Amino acid sequence: SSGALIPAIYMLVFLLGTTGNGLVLWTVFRSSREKRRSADIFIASLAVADLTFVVTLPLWATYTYRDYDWPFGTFFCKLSSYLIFVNMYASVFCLTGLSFDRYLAIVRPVANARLRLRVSGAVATAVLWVLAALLAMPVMVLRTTGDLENTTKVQCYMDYSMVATVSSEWAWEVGLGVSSTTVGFVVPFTIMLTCYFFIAQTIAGHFRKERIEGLRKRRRLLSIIVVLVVTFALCWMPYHLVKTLYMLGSLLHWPCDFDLFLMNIFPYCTCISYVNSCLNPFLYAFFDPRFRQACTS
């Protein structure tokens, strides 16, 4: 059932992400430096991160297709998981930076002009990249490969043996999990929620009148906010939501029914979590002029 259907989703999303990200990367890198702006500084990072995110999929597609017996040695899954996670972190942090810049460069300077220049925007993107990379050290030091029970199936996993101390074991495990999930989800979720709410309020108050020509512009602009929020939501509830439900089931000591449902639905949410890199290029390209003109105005 799932073990056969899921590889189709992985291969389709792999093709889509690779093609789209490659096209957007080539069309933005071909342009000269003078045409580039801080928005391009952000979008190049997003496109390259998504390409690296999407490239590593067939290594797992074959693993799923071959009855879960990993043929690619130790270091390959090491690199695959490291790159996938660092790419997701870079995605979230680049989205955070883009939202912050879009919120700022429209209304902040008239209120107060205290910000770093776009020349240092590359430095800010590099800082986000390096913090994202260093946030994923325990995850690699928890990829100790090996074989499970004596059946031939092998798949690299984590063995909680580096801690070597019981009291430190559970405390650091739960602390790492909760800190990672909260810093990666609740802060971005709330900050984009507030920024989109402010945008909705200002576009509702900006066009309370009924002038002859601006209603179409208002409609196409308000479509952008709703499509953005719905895409962000549909790509971000699944992972952290099943995360929260899985941790809640631990202390709740609820019967095995909900745990079975979680472990049977997690493949689907981890499948659907790729829609970010699946649809980022089109949704950026088709709305770039709207974002630029609204931010300038």
Binding site: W60, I84, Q155, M158, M263, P267
Partner: peptide, 15 residues
């Protein structure tokens, strides 16, 4: 079945 964190890093996961 009572399997201790079997799909935690086995099923198709990126945890």
């Amino acid at each position: 079945l009572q399997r201790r964190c079997m799909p935690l890093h086995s099923r198709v996961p990126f945890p």
